[PDB]
Amino acid sequence: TEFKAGSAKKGATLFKTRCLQCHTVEKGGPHKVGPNLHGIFGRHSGQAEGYSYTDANIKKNVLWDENNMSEYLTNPKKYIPGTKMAFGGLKKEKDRNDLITYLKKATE
Numbered sequence: 001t002e003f004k005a006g007s008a009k010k011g012a013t014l015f016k017t018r019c020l021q022c023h024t025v026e027k028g029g030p031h032k033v034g035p036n037l038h039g040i041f042g043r044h045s046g047q048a049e050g051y052s053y054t055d056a057n058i059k060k061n062v063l064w065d066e067n068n069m070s071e072y073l074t075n076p077k078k079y080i081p082g083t084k085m086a087f088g089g090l091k092k093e094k095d096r097n098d099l100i101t102y103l104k105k106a107t108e
Ligand code: HEC
Pocket: 015, 018, 019, 020, 021, 022, 023, 033, 034, 035, 037, 040, 044, 045, 046, 047, 048, 052, 053, 054, 057, 064, 069, 073, 082, 083, 084, 085, 086, 087, 090, 099, 103
């Protein structure tokens, strides 16, 4: 484990063909296949603006952090067994660390 930080614009071009198909991260961004992500960092799992999660995502209530959300992205299915996050998981750490650097820099 060594968060060798990436580039917020590599994380952007990654996000744009990994997560944008289901999620939003600008604060005007409507919820869709999943919630918005703008303000997840420092929240618990399951707290977007009036949006209904799963029983498993709620009973998880993970404090979304730099390290803690990187764990979840490695295998979201195992981390929240029953999650609506149909995705699969970002196997490669380097490619995660870029996306983290973006999503963080889209929250502050
Ligand atoms: C559509 C098939 C999805 C893709 C592609 C990605 N995500 Fe996802 N995510 C999805 C859902 C429907 C949910 C809610 C799960 C539930 O069962 O209620 C989520 C949740 C997240 C969260 C947590 C939000 C919160 O707890 O408030 C994060 C931080 C998140 N997702 C990040 C994320 C990233 C960065 C993705 C690209 C690698 C990505 N998701 C793809 C659905 C889908």
